[PDB]
Design an enzyme around this catalytic site. Sequence first.
Site, short mmCIF file in Angstrom:
data_model
loop_
_atom_site.label_atom_id
_atom_site.label_comp_id
_atom_site.label_asym_id
_atom_site.label_seq_id
_atom_site.Cartn_x
_atom_site.Cartn_y
_atom_site.Cartn_z
N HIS A 62 22.65 4.64 32.75
CA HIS A 62 21.86 4.91 33.65
C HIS A 62 20.35 4.44 33.35
O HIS A 62 19.53 4.05 34.41
CB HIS A 62 21.38 6.58 33.75
CG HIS A 62 22.69 7.25 33.67
ND1 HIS A 62 23.42 8.16 32.86
CD2 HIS A 62 23.30 7.49 34.72
CE1 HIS A 62 24.42 8.51 33.24
NE2 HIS A 62 24.32 8.36 34.69
N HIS A 92 12.06 6.28 27.66
CA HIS A 92 12.91 5.34 28.86
C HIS A 92 12.03 5.03 29.91
O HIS A 92 10.87 5.59 29.88
CB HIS A 92 14.36 6.06 29.13
CG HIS A 92 13.71 7.23 29.83
ND1 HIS A 92 13.72 8.70 29.11
CD2 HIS A 92 13.78 7.54 31.01
CE1 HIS A 92 13.35 9.37 29.88
NE2 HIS A 92 13.27 8.83 31.30
N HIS A 94 12.36 4.11 34.30
CA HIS A 94 12.90 4.06 35.69
C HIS A 94 12.37 2.85 36.45
O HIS A 94 10.96 2.84 36.41
CB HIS A 94 12.71 5.36 36.56
CG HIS A 94 12.96 6.63 35.85
ND1 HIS A 94 14.23 7.20 36.01
CD2 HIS A 94 12.33 7.13 34.70
CE1 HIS A 94 14.12 8.35 35.11
NE2 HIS A 94 13.26 8.37 34.42
N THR A 196 14.35 14.72 35.45
CA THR A 196 14.73 13.93 36.73
C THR A 196 16.24 13.58 36.93
O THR A 196 16.61 12.62 37.81
CB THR A 196 13.73 12.82 37.10
OG1 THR A 196 13.88 11.92 35.96
CG2 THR A 196 12.03 13.35 36.99
C1 LIG Z 1 23.75 17.59 26.71
C2 LIG Z 1 22.69 17.96 25.83
O1 LIG Z 1 22.48 17.96 24.53
C3 LIG Z 1 21.24 17.82 26.49
C4 LIG Z 1 20.05 18.60 25.75
C5 LIG Z 1 18.95 17.82 25.49
C6 LIG Z 1 19.37 16.98 27.08
C7 LIG Z 1 18.15 15.92 27.51
C8 LIG Z 1 17.08 16.50 28.07
C9 LIG Z 1 16.05 15.28 28.03
C10 LIG Z 1 16.45 14.48 29.26
C11 LIG Z 1 15.62 13.36 29.51
C12 LIG Z 1 15.79 12.24 30.57
O2 LIG Z 1 15.00 12.35 31.70
S1 LIG Z 1 13.45 12.56 32.28
N1 LIG Z 1 13.40 11.30 33.43
O3 LIG Z 1 13.65 13.92 32.94
O4 LIG Z 1 12.60 12.19 31.31
C13 LIG Z 1 17.27 12.33 30.81
C14 LIG Z 1 17.99 13.35 30.57
C15 LIG Z 1 17.80 13.87 29.15
C16 LIG Z 1 18.00 12.78 27.99
C17 LIG Z 1 18.78 15.13 28.74
C18 LIG Z 1 20.43 14.72 28.56
C19 LIG Z 1 21.20 15.95 28.19
C20 LIG Z 1 20.53 16.64 26.96
C21 LIG Z 1 20.80 15.61 25.72
ZN LIG Z 2 12.75 9.59 33.05
#
Ligand SMILES: CC(=O)[C@H]1CC[C@H]2[C@@H]3CC[C@H]4C[C@H](OS(N)(=O)=O)CC[C@]4(C)[C@H]3CC[C@]12C
Ligand SMILES: [Zn+2]
Length: 258
Positions: A62, A92, A94, A196
Amino acid sequence: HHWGYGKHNGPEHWHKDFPIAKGERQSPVDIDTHTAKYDPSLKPLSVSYDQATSLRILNNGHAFNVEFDDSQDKAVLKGGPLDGTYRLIQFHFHWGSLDGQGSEHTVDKKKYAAELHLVHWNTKYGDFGKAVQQPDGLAVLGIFLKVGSAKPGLQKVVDVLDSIKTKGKSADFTNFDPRGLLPESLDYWTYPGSLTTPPLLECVTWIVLKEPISVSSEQVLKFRKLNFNGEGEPEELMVDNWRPAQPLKNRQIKASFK
Ligand SMILES: CC(=O)[C@H]1CC[C@H]2[C@@H]3CC[C@H]4C[C@H](OS(N)(=O)=O)CC[C@]4(C)[C@H]3CC[C@]12C
Ligand SMILES: [Zn+2]
């Protein structure tokens, strides 16, 4: 048929697997600068990245994530609209297929070429996984990118992308200082929102800096050479990995500045 950014699995599809996609506090949003109210009760942002320890960079199919060692009280965000202390876990971006799009937040409907997210979790919930189950679990610092002068502090990131072209590739990425990605001013807008990407959890205090950083055309072109696909799959350029602005609903965007 996993979620992504394409015609068949993109943002307009996410609500089927993640019904919170149509929720009351979804991100990103358009920031209407004339309707955002100056809040004199807001504090200056406290960004303390002096001791930030990067570990690794990862292509997750992604975006690419620069991950930090969050095992100690080092890289912390506090003040601004926040109560308590939030620890940096990753950043990260976008970005777009073209300079005219790529940001998730917009400013009076203006789209920037890209947007940097520095993700922090509320230390009161002990870890990242527990924090995202809480309405005040995360603080994401959003920084717009425009194309102009190079950002010298970004070049170490750009130069490692060749080594993580495809989904599932990671590389050692130690001693990266995220202070080199910050603009001069910490003037910001803030509102309650969500992740997001799926799972779109409504756990984020958004802090979006008014001042963009400038990156060069060459820097952002190297972002656009990454791949959504895994090694030995049909090439899908990693571009347009942004969610469009979502309805503001019953929310106020507050400005730290007059
Ligand atoms: C499946 C998990 O363990 C969850 C717990 C924390 C979650 C994370 C919360 C933080 C967000 C930030 C990121 O996006 S953003 N654009 O809202 O900052 C993408 C998803 C991600 C990495 C998520 C992926 C799924 C995670 C790892
Ligand atoms: Zn983001």
